[PDB]
Amino acid sequence: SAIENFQPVTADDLAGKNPANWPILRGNYQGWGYSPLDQINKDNVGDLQLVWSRTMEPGSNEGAAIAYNGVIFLGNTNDVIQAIDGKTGSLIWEYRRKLPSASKFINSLGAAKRSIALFGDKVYFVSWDNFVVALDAKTGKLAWETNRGQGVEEGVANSSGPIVVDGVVIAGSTCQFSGFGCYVTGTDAESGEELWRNTFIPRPGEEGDDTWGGAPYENRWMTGAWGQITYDPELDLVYYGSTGAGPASEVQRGTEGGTLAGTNTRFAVKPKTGEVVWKHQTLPRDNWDSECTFEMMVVSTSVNPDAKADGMMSVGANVPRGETRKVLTGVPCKTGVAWQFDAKTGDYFWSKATVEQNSIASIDDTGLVTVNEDMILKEPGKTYNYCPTFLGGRDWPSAGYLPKSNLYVIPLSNACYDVMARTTEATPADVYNTDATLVLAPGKTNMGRVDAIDLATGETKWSYETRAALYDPVLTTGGDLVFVGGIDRDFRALDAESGKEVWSTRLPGAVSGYTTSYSIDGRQYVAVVSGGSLGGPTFGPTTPDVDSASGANGIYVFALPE
Numbered sequence: 001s002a003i004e005n006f007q008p009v010t011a012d013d014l015a016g017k018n019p020a021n022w023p024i025l026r027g028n029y030q031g032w033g034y035s036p037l038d039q040i041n042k043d044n045v046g047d048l049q050l051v052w053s054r055t056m057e058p059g060s061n062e063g064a065a066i067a068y069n070g071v072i073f074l075g076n077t078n079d080v081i082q083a084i085d086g087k088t089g090s091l092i093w094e095y096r097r098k099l100p101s102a103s104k105f106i107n108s109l110g111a112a113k114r115s116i117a118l119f120g121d122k123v124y125f126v127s128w129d130n131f132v133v134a135l136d137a138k139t140g141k142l143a144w145e146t147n148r149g150q151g152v153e154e155g156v157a158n159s160s161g162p163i164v165v166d167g168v169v170i171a172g173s174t175c176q177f178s179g180f181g182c183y184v185t186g187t188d189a190e191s192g193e194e195l196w197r198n199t200f201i202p203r204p205g206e207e208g209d210d211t212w213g214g215a216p217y218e219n220r221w222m223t224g225a226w227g228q229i230t231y232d233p234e235l236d237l238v239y240y241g242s243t244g245a246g247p248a249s250e251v252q253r254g255t256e257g258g259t260l261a262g263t264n265t266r267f268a269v270k271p272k273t274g275e276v277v278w279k280h281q282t283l284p285r286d287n288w289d290s291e292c293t294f295e296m297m298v299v300s301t302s303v304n305p306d307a308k309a310d311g312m313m314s315v316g317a318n319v320p321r322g323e324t325r326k327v328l329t330g331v332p333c334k335t336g337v338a339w340q341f342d343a344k345t346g347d348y349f350w351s352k353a354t355v356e357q358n359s360i361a362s363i364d365d366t367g368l369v370t371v372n373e374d375m376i377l378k379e380p381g382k383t384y385n386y387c388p389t390f391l392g393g394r395d396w397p398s399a400g401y402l403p404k405s406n407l408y409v410i411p412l413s414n415a416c417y418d419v420m421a422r423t424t425e426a427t428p429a430d431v432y433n434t435d436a437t438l439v440l441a442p443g444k445t446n447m448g449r450v451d452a453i454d455l456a457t458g459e460t461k462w463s464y465e466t467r468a469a470l471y472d473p474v475l476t477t478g479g480d481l482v483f484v485g486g487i488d489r490d491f492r493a494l495d496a497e498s499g500k501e502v503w504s505t506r507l508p509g510a511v512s513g514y515t516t517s518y519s520i521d522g523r524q525y526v527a528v529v530s531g532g533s534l535g536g537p538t539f540g541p542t543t544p545d546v547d548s549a550s551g552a553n554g555i556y557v558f559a560l561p562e
């Protein structure tokens with residue numbers, strides 16, 4: 001019935017033109033994480049009730065209810081993909097991939113899945129075994145699949161999910177446990193043919209190779225692009241970011257002094273070809289697993305940064321002050337520094353720290369980052385008191401945009417990392433080859449935090465704090481609300497103007513996944529994926545007074561009483 005008269009998903013849908021739907025991870029191509037739906041607002045949110053819910057597969061539950069014309073498309077863990085009636089919560093179809101023994105996968109991160117993608121009459125995802133897979137949206141039955149290579153025992157996978165642009169499925173990758181780097185690919189959405197593949201680690205003698213400190217090519221590991229991909233239709237530019245290299249210590253890498261061209265770089269590329277239009281390295285010489293791979297938003301804003309705003313690192317030499325620009329903006333790396341660029345040219349406008357950070361000594365008026373020499377992991381076994389941590393700061397949990405107030409709303413953790421490089425030799429299995437203790441940032445008694453930053457001035461308008469880590473995405477809405485989950489298991493709504501909590505419900509486990517909103521027959525629904533991720537186990541022990549249990553993975557859906 002719900003699936004019956006399925007209409008093909010177009011670029012108009014994916015650009016977020018129909019606010020009744022949420023047909024892409026952040027509601028629109030541009031990465032806003034916003035629903036224009038305004039039925040639910042601060043005056044009635046207190047009445048929100050559970051309408052329906054459904055159990056999801058076990059494991060790290062970071063996915064999103066992709067809603068389209070009354071149907072929820074839902075990536076579970078373990079390559080289980082569901083269509084669910086968005087009104088009743090009844091299963092419509094389920095695809096369950098045949099998996100080899102989990103022990104065969106060296107990269108367990110590929111079990112989690114932040115999104116599927118929609119285009120035409122197909123659902124698109126990347127499997128744990130590193131295939132781009134297309135299912136029939138109407139039935140969940142496989143239409144085609146294409147092996148990208150190096151899956152399973154070789155550890156290339158994907159955790160964020162693809163987007164489809166101009167008939168091209170664009171998907172990044174994680175190779176966290178591999179003795180090599182990885183890539184972003186574009187795949188034809190109808191034929192399944194790989195059209196292009198962009199890599200990051202320079203080959204010997206090629207542009208950037210001299211920034212790797214002499215490290216043999218085969219010793220350059222783990223540089224990937226595992227975060228969220230965004231897109232601007234008008235400019236026709238796809239945006240993604242690459243990550244760092246392992247192990248964390250440049251001494252152990254053999255890259256002393258190396259700024260590591262290709263790593264932690266923000267790329268703007270043409271969707272059909274992968275051609276790089278512009279790029280900017282947001283964290284050079286990474287010794288801190290900084291991963292500048294997180295979603296970056298395309299918004300139009302007046303440009304007027306305050307050099308005295310809290311955390312402001314620097315303002316661009318050629319900042320077009322007072323002018324309105326389409327910008328690429330947000331926090332790309334775990335470090336928690338917000339950046340703003342001209343979306344078309346990559347001209348640097350400004351950058352601004354949020355959480356306590358000590359990896360970046362300065363950023364000059366061109367956007368050139370100089371790292372803090374004191375935090376380079378130069379002596380194995382020495383404890384370096386890094387701020388933030390290998391989980392931020394920010395991490396994958398996405399920001400939201402409030403277009404009425406021009407606020408960028410980002411969930412953050414007030415944590416620092418007492419980290420040391422192990423004294424034993426690093427292998428790819430060892431990842432960053434570090435041991436660490438996580439602590440609250442200096443003078444902070446609240447681990448969970450949400451900052452709302454004015455994109456014109458860089459001023460923080462409000463900041464919400466709570467005892468335990470949030471480590472969960474935000475949803476912003478046209479009802480002037482911000483929804484966010486936490487490891488305290490609360491799913492809460494904040495007043496978008498003040499940051500003050502106006503409603504909450506407590507879910508059975510840490511609220512670990514995305515929140516989306518859609519409507520059916522005029523009724524607004526708010527859907528959250530819950531149960532647990534790496535967040536609770538990591539941040540929970542710092543605030544053991546909070547009951548941060550994981551469990552009961554599911555989608556949980558709320559609405560006002562009929």
Ligand SMILES: O=C(O)c1cc(C(=O)O)c2c(n1)C(=O)C(=O)c1cc(C(=O)O)[nH]c1-2
Pocket residue numbers: 060062109110112158159160173174175176222224226243289291390391395396533534535
């Ligand atoms: O370097 C990589 O390839 C890679 C992949 C992943 C993943 O795909 O989830 C994470 C990280 N890195 C990472 O550094 C990190 O802190 C992290 C947290 C999470 C999560 O699910 O909470 N995934 C990942």
Ligand SMILES: [Ca+2]
Pocket residue numbers: 176243289291
């Ligand atoms: Ca990583």
Ligand SMILES: [Cl-]
Pocket residue numbers: 007013018021069
């Ligand atoms: Cl529609």
Ligand SMILES: [Zn+2]
Pocket residue numbers: 009010012013018
């Ligand atoms: Zn449509």
Ligand SMILES: [Zn+2]
Pocket residue numbers: 279280281346347348366367
């Ligand atoms: Zn630049």
Ligand SMILES: [Zn+2]
Pocket residue numbers: 306308309457459
């Ligand atoms: Zn100011």
Ligand SMILES: [Zn+2]
Pocket residue numbers: 490492501503504505
């Ligand atoms: Zn509450």
